[PDB]
Each structure stands twice: as C-alpha cells, then as structure tokens.
Design a protein around this ligand. Structure first.
Ligand SMILES: N#CC[C@H](NC(=O)c1c[nH]c(/C=C/C(=O)N2CCCC2)c1-c1ccc(Cl)cc1F)c1ccc(F)c(Cl)c1
Ligand code: NA
Length: 302
C-alpha cells in the first residue's frame, strides 16, 4: 500500500500542536481532532481550516467514535472525570450521557442503540436513550485480566468480547474463554463476523479453533478500512505517545501482509475515511529530545 502525505493540520493559534486522536465525520466534510486539553476541533478537510471547537474533557482525549448517522459522538479521556461521554451533534453540541469511570467506550455495531464501556476487567453495556446500565459483564472464574482490556461488540451485536471471553448478550453469560498468550491485549472482531483477532492469535468464531498466529500483530491496536478489505495494526509502546513510529497493513480476507509504513515520528492515532480515499495519522513532529510534544495531523492519500 502507498501513502502519499498531502496535508498537515496543526492546532491553529498555538506554538506547539496538541492533537491526540482523530476520526472522520460520518458524512465526508470534517476531520474531528481531539486535543491534549480535552477539546474536540472540527477541521474542514477540503479547506484545511478549523470550523468548530467543542469542550469535552479536562485531560487529553484518547478515543473518538462518531455514530454512522452523524448525530452522536463517543469520547474518552485520560484522567479527568468523566473518563468517557456521549455527545449529540445536532443543533447544539450537548453531552447526552457520561460513563464516568469507563476509560474506553464503543458503539454497538448493527443497530447503534447501545454503548459498551470498559473499566479494568469489566464491561458495561448502556442504553443510548436512557443512559442506564443494562448489563455488567465480568466472570472472575474466566477472566484473563488483560492489562489493556477493551470490550467490544461483534458486527451483529449478539456477542461481546471482554477480556478475551466471548459473551452471549441476550442470555447474559460467557460462552467461551480464549486462552491467554499475552499480558495486555484483549482483542477485536473482524468486520466479516467470522474471526476474532486477539493479539497475535486469529481464532475461528464458528469452531473456536486457532486459525493463524501473526507475530507482527503483537501488542497492536487494529482498525479496518470502511469496506473491511484492509487491516491496519500499530504496536503500542510498553506501558507519552501510545504507539511507536510504524504501522502495518494486511489484506483483511486472508491476513496477507501488505506494507510496513514507518513515518519516523511517534504515532498517537490513525483513522480512515468512509470512501477508502484518505488515512489521517496523528504524529509527534517534535524532535527526540524536545521538552514538549508537537502533535500534528497528517492526511495521506491511500
Ligand atoms: N479508535 C481507534 C484507532 C486506534 N487508536 C487507538 O487504539 C488509540 C489511540 N490513542 C490511544 C491512547 C491514547 C492515550 O492513552 N494517551 C494519549 C494522550 C495521553 C495518553 C489508543 C489506545 C491505546 C491502547 C488501548 Cl488498549 C486502546 C486505545 F484506544 C488505532 C488502531 C490502529 C492503529 F494503527 C492505530 Cl495507530 C490506532
Ligand atoms: Na478470510
């Protein structure tokens, strides 16, 4: 895969830039950029200009997820309460609900009517409308205690992976524990609905057998392109930039290695657009020994 840098966004009216995460708007107009002070900046991709600034947190934004319908946004931050929140993005920018001690959140996938939050080894499922906690998912007997566990729904919303344990949501119980082969990473569902990727191990969802071991995915966070044909993986720094300077691409259909991309700067986040046209990467432009970070967003043609 080739990645041509075409633009750079820098926190305007500032000496050093403080972006920490990125997501493309559900409709193609904006790049949403979270900052190290807890703001969310909306940049017009075409004009290159900031058009809005929203107040979300009082510490660095760690995670952004826009709903597909364009109406809602999840955020997470690093140490200020609430650690996660849900925002409405219609006429007014509103906090709809917060998830005060959950340090990571995602939407449900099939129908975006729920949020799943993670607090340590525990998952919480919330109703978007009421904000009420519907489920708590934790089994002390099956737990892997992954240090960087993040809970997630599968594509049809009927299963959750939490701490390497598969849960049936409708009957609220664990159905399988995947064996523990690392200390940190808890895994994700492939958008195809057929595999679960837990660190270096690719598991078959139908039979639960190990299909592949991919050493290059060790300690990686993973994201797919819109059509689910390319998987991006970047290795976390040992637990400050969350990643090192490289990410790798794989063909999502057979896991075939594509490319290693080293931008020679530490990476804070990576996001893809809906049209498979652009990749945005938050990169520390600052020198190795600089006292302060200078994290910009670089836009790449895919
Ligand atoms: N969403 C999304 C995209 C996803 N981003 C992250 O995973 C991500 C992006 N950022 C933080 C964390 C900041 C953080 O802790 N900070 C930043 C400022 C101070 C502390 C995390 C992150 C790290 C650990 C955990 Cl277990 C989960 C997290 F979401 C990603 C997927 C593939 C990739 F190739 C890349 Cl480069 C990124
Ligand atoms: Na496949």
């Amino acid at each position: 895969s080739a990645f041509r840098p075409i633009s750079v966004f820098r926190e305007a009216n500032e000496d050093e830039s403080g972006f920490t995460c990125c997501a493309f708007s559900a409709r193609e107009r904006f790049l949403m950029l979270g900052t190290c002070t807890g703001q969310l900046k909306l940049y017009n991709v075409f004009s290159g200009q900031e058009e809005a600034s929203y107040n979300c947190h009082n510490s660095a934004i760690t995670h952004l997820e826009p709903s597909r319908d364009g109406s809602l946004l999840l955020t997470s931050a690093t140490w200020s309460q609430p650690l996660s929140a849900l925002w409405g993005m219609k006429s007014v920018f509103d906090m709809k609900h917060s998830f005060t001690e959950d340090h990571y959140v995602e939407f449900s996938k099939h129908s975006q009517d729920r949020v799943i939050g993670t607090k340590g080894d525990i998952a919480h499922i919330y109703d978007i409308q009421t904000g009420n906690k519907l489920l708590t998912l934790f089994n002390p007997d099956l737990a892997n205690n992954y240090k960087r566990n993040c809970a997630t729904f599968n594509p049809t919303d009927d299963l959750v992976l939490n701490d390497g344990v598969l849960w049936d949501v409708r009957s609220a119980q664990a159905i399988h524990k995947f064996d523990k082969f690392n200390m940190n990473i808890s895994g994700v569902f492939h958008p195809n609905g057929l595999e679960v990727i837990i660190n270096t191990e690719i598991w078959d969802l139908r039979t639960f057998h190990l299909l592949h071991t991919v050493p290059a995915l060790d300690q990686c966070r993973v994201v797919f392109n819109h059509t689910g044909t390319v998987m991006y993986g970047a290795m976390l720094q040992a637990d400050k930039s969350p990643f090192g300077s490289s990410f790798r691409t794989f063909n999502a259909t057979d896991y075939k290695p594509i490319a290693t991309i080293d931008v020679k700067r530490n990476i804070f986040d990576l996001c893809t657009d809906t049209k498979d046209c652009y990749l945005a990467v938050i990169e520390n432009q600052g020198s190795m020994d600089a006292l302060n970070m200078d994290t910009v967003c670089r836009l790449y043609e895919v």
